[PDB]
Amino acid sequence: VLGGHECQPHSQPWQAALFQGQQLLCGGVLVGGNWVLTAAHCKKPKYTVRLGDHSLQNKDGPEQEIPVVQSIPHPCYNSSDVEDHNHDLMLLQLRDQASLGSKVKPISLADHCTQPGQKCTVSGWGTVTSPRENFPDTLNCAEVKIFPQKKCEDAYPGQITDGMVCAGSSKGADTCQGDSGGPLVCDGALQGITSWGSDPCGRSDKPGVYTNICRYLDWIKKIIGSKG
Ligand SMILES: [Ca+2]
């Protein structure tokens, strides 16, 4: 996350992180008591969901390691060709219900589709510098604005689907490597998942592209309540 800042600890209680021992892999979004929503391209045979964390270095207190008992990506995603990022969406079922409260909380799914110019936020432990990469110990947040789908399609010709949405900031705020899977939150609801973006990150030329959650509400709510 560039053009951002260290969030207030546990001000994003839905924030999750995918780990392999002590290597950060991707972000995550707590959607259910026993469900995490992340980017499909973060799939790996082996990872830990880590909830209620702020500083990787130090003990914050609301840390919950949680194993995954189901890796459910979108059935229209294809992890084969690097040029296509369509349906980059995955739900991960947790082994047990996460210990809920004010520092660990499921975020609600947006029941309306977005509009260009709408206030939104992104968060992650991804690198805050581009092109040279140094990574943050603490969770970083930043504010972004969702782009019009037409201007979205102009910065990435023939790369943007209706199941995507662009979010960006002139002022330098844009997710980067390490932030995939993390949340895009608009009006206290999850509207998108960090998918892919600009080289280098933070270019005013190129925004960030996010899975469009308001499009997949039926598929998510189906497996949030029929697989859960
Ligand atoms: Ca910690």
Residue numbers in the entry: 16 to 36, 38 to 67, 69 to 95, 95A, 95B, 95C, 96 to 125, 128 to 186, ...
What does the paper say about this structure?
KLK8, formerly termed hK8, belongs to the 15 human kallikrein-related peptidases of the trypsin-like family S1A, with the MEROPS code S01.2445. KLK8 is secreted as an inactive pro-enzyme, whereby a signal peptide is cut off, followed by propeptide cleavage at the Lys15-Val16 bond, releasing active enzyme.
The corresponding 2.1 Å structure of KLK8, in which Zn2+ was not clearly identified, is referred to as KLK8-leup and resembles largely the KLK8-Ca molecule. By contrast, the P21 form of KLK8-leup contains four copies of the aldehyde inhibitor leupeptin, with the sequence acetyl-Leu1i-Leu2i-Argininal3i. Leupeptin binds covalently to Ser195 as analogue of an acyl intermediate in the canonical conformation. The P1-Arg3i aldehyde group in KLK8-leup is covalently linked to Ser195 Oγ as hemiacetal, with the oxygen occupying the oxyanion hole in the four KLK8 copies. Similar to a substrate, leupeptin forms a short antiparallel β-sheet with two backbone hydrogen bonds between P3-Leu1i and Gly216, and the amide of P1-Arg3i and the carbonyl oxygen of Ser214. The funnel-shaped S2 subsite of KLK8 is bordered by the hydrophobic side-chains of His57, His99, and partially Trp215, which explains very well the accommodation of the Leu2i side-chain of the inhibitor and the preference for the aliphatic Val and Leu residues in the substrate profiling.
